[PDB]
Design a protein around this ligand. Sequence first.
Ligand SMILES: CC(=O)N[C@@H]1[C@@H](O)[C@H](O[C@@H]2O[C@H](CO)[C@@H](O[C@@H]3O[C@H](CO)[C@@H](O)[C@H](O)[C@H]3NC(C)=O)[C@H](O)[C@H]2NC(C)=O)[C@@H](CO)O[C@H]1O
Ligand SMILES: [Cl-]
Ligand code: NA
Length: 129
Amino acid sequence: KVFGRCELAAAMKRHGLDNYRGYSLGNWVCAAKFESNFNTQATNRNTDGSTDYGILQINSRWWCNDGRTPGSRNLCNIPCSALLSSDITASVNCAKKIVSNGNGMNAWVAWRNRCKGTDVQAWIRGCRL
Ligand SMILES: CC(=O)N[C@@H]1[C@@H](O)[C@H](O[C@@H]2O[C@H](CO)[C@@H](O[C@@H]3O[C@H](CO)[C@@H](O)[C@H](O)[C@H]3NC(C)=O)[C@H](O)[C@H]2NC(C)=O)[C@@H](CO)O[C@H]1O
Ligand SMILES: [Cl-]
Ligand code: NA
């Protein structure tokens, strides 16, 4: 599923991401935009053999199991395919664990390079939350 900007903002808010660990909603929407372009089915392979999954591009070497990342941790205790669902619950739940330790949102490279230090509030402009 390819989410709309305000549509995603509303779902994330509902799932308790607004100000989770001090990170305002604009940060999460900005992160999703540059990590997956709001596409829940996005996947990307890395050089170490791991793969990033879903709207928040969660990595298989640490957070989920895809059965092909030799010696990887499954910290969110879920198969990576659960992160590609049109329902973002699984992704949000795992994201909460990720940001809870580590370097906070720096775990998302697109956030660190394209959202951090910018006016993230603009990502939720015009939305009815
Ligand atoms: C969205 C996403 O999947 N991002 C991935 C990053 O999570 C990943 O970074 C590495 O994450 C692990 C787990 O949080 C880090 O390990 C932890 O590091 C802290 C210190 O910051 C330490 O106190 C924790 O005990 C330790 N936990 C474990 C289980 O080892 C690790 O430092 C991160 N590594 C780096 C280079 O940032 C990166 C790198 O694989 O990939 C992203 O896709
Ligand atoms: Cl933090
Ligand atoms: Na894994």
